[PDB]
């Protein structure tokens, strides 16, 4: 969020306006809660990928069906690896406080990648929704709100 304000005041010839300094000071204050939320999502990763695969393959069985992409153990392992990647990028966005280092690695060219891989993007969005539900069950209320923030950004991005 510091790079955001820095390039924001850098396109202008002005310095960083002190309201931006206030938002940086407030983010610096909230960084400890951000780090605890990121560590709580860090250590419990395989539970979240398990419950996300659970809720997704209960929701959409066509990836399980042989016409779909995630058919067989190798393809379903690649599917849960993709969900692991997106959980990792969500933890990066939780620490960074703003969605730039997660959009730069997971969002900015995802539609043409998944189009030329054959997979549907709506099933990936449902998988990140299942990750958001499982992390909402894993965390407290003020933690699940702040995690569902960036999970919500990913779900809106994949659609």
């Amino acid at each position: 969020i510091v790079t955001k304000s820095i390039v924001n005041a850098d396109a202008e010839a002005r310095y960083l306006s002190p309201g931006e300094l206030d938002r940086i000071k407030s983010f610096v204050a909230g960084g400890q809660q951000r780090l605890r939320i990121a560590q709580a999502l860090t250590d419990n990763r395989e539970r979240l990928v398990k419950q996300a695969g659970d809720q997704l393959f209960q929701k959409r069985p066509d990836v399980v069906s042989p016409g779909g992409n995630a058919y067989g153990q190798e393809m379903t392992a690649t599917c849960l690896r993709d969900l692991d990647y997106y959980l990792r990028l969500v933890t990066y966005g939780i620490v960074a406080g703003d969605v730039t280092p997660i959009e730069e690695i997971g969002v900015i060219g995802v539609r043409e990648m998944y189009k030329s891989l054959g997979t549907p993007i709506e099933a990936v969005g449902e998988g990140v929704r299942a990750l958001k539900n499982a992390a909402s069950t894993l965390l407290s209320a003020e933690d699940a709100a702040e995690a569902g923030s960036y999970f919500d950004y990913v779900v809106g991005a994949l659609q």
Binding site: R36, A40, D43, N44, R47
Partner: protein, 160 residues
Amino acid sequence: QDAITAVINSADVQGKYLDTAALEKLKAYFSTGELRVRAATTISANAAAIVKEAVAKSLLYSDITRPGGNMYTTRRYAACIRDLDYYLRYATYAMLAGDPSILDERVLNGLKETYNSLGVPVGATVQAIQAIKEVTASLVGADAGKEMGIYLDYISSGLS
């Protein structure tokens, strides 16, 4: 007993008033009570998931659930789930009290007598409490997982 009640008792049996070291102890307890309450809430959230994950980590697919093992009969499996739920619940009570005396008074009193009477394996119970401790330290975070693991290791050490 509490940590508050233990501090008051230790000041009482001397006839001592509340000196500054006891006030330091009470103020440290009043500082740590925040994460104590938050940890107790999220452990009360999903206790069944913790017990399920712990038996899937430690006890399942062993010889213990095979015939001949102590968890073969389905009433014995239900008794196993009951004992693990007891360990987690009383560890939650000892974490929120900040004093392990309720574990000594309500759980660890005549428990080795019972487990040697019934033929319950003690080492598998210790490993199950260890798996409980790892699962809840992952679930709650490291900072409250330390205090949860202290009382779960207290149960494990008194059991052995």
